Amino acid sequence: NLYKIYQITDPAKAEKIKSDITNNYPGSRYAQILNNTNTDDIPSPEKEYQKWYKLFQEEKFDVVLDNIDNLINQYSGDEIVSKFELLKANTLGKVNGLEAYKKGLENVADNYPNSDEGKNAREI
C-alpha cells in the first residue's frame, strides 16, 4: 500500500520500497506483481480445486473421497477451504444420502458463517 501511495505521489520512495519488496522480502504474490513476472506461482483455486471440480463433474467419487479428506486440512489457511468443505458435503450427500448432505451443509454453515459458502449453506 505504501508502494501504491508513493507511486501516486513521490515515486522515488515508491521505487525504493518496490526494490525492497522484490529483493529483501520476496512475497508470494507481491514480488512477482511489482515487477509483473507471471502467474507461475500456484494459486489456491487453480490448484487441486479447478481439476478437483472436474473430478466432481465426471462422476468419480471414490478417489475424491480421500482426496477431500486429506485436502480439507492440507490446504487450511485460506477461503478455499470453505469451497473444499462444500464439495466434500456435496460428494457425501451424492454417495450416502440426504442426512449426510444436511450434516455437511450445517457443518459448513457452522465453520464459516461469514462467507458466500456460508450463505449458500443457510439457503439450501
Binding site: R29, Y30, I33, P43, E79
Partner: protein, 173 residues
C-alpha cells in the same frame, strides 16, 4: 369536378438550406456524443484492467468496492447511451423537432395556395404509397418552396418605399 393538388414533404425539406444545415449540426452533435461514449468505454476498460492486474493482492472487501464502482460506471454509460441515442432519446427527439417550423410554414402556405387556386384537396404525396401516379401539373411543391424562400429572405422596405406603398394602398379612399 374536384381539383386535387399535392406536395412532397421530402422534396420540400431537401430544398430548404437551413434545414439541411441544422441536420448537419445535429449529426455533428451526435458524433460528439459518440466520442464521449467512447471515452466512457475507455475509462471503464482501464478500470477493469486495473482490477484484473492486482486482483490477487486485494481483500474481498476491496474487490467488492472496485467491482461495485465498475458496475456503477457501466450503468452510467448505459444510461447515457440510452438517454442520447434511445428510441425516444435526445438525438431522435431533436431530429423530429427540426422540421416542425418548416411544417408550420408549409401548412400555412398550402392553405393560402388552396384558397388562391381553387383546389379542393391538397395531399402530402410522401406520407404513404396511395398516390401511385401523380401528374406534375398539380404539384405545388415548387410554389411552396418559392414561398418559403421568399419569407426566409424577407427585407424591410425603406422609408421612401413605405411611403410609396402607403400612397398606393390608400388610393381606394
Amino acid at each position: 369536378t374536384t381539383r386535387i393538388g399535392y406536395i412532397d414533404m421530402e422534396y420540400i425539406l431537401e430544398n430548404v438550406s437551413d434545414y439541411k444545415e441544422a441536420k448537419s449540426q445535429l449529426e455533428l452533435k451526435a458524433q460528439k456524443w459518440k466520442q464521449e461514449i467512447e471515452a466512457k468505454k475507455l475509462n471503464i476498460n482501464s478500470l477493469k484492467e486495473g482490477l484484473k492486474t492486482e486482483k490477487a493482492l486485494l481483500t474481498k472487501e476491496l474487490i467488492e468496492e472496485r467491482e461495485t464502482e465498475i458496475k456503477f460506471q457501466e450503468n452510467e454509460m448505459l444510461d447515457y447511451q440510452q438517454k442520447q441515442f434511445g428510441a425516444d432519446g435526445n438525438l431522435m427527439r431533436q431530429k423530429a423537432a427540426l422540421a416542425k417550423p418548416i411544417q408550420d410554414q408549409v401548412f400555412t402556405a398550402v392553405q393560402d395556395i388552396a384558397e388562391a387556386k381553387n383546389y379542393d384537396f391538397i395531399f402530402d404525396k410522401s406520407s404513404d404509397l396511395t398516390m401511385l401516379f401523380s401528374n406534375k401539373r398539380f404539384d405545388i411543391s415548387d410554389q411552396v418552396i418559392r414561398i418559403l424562400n421568399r419569407t426566409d429572405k424577407r427585407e424591410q422596405l425603406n422609408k421612401k418605399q413605405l411611403k410609396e406603398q402607403e400612397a398606393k394602398e390608400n388610393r381606394e379612399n
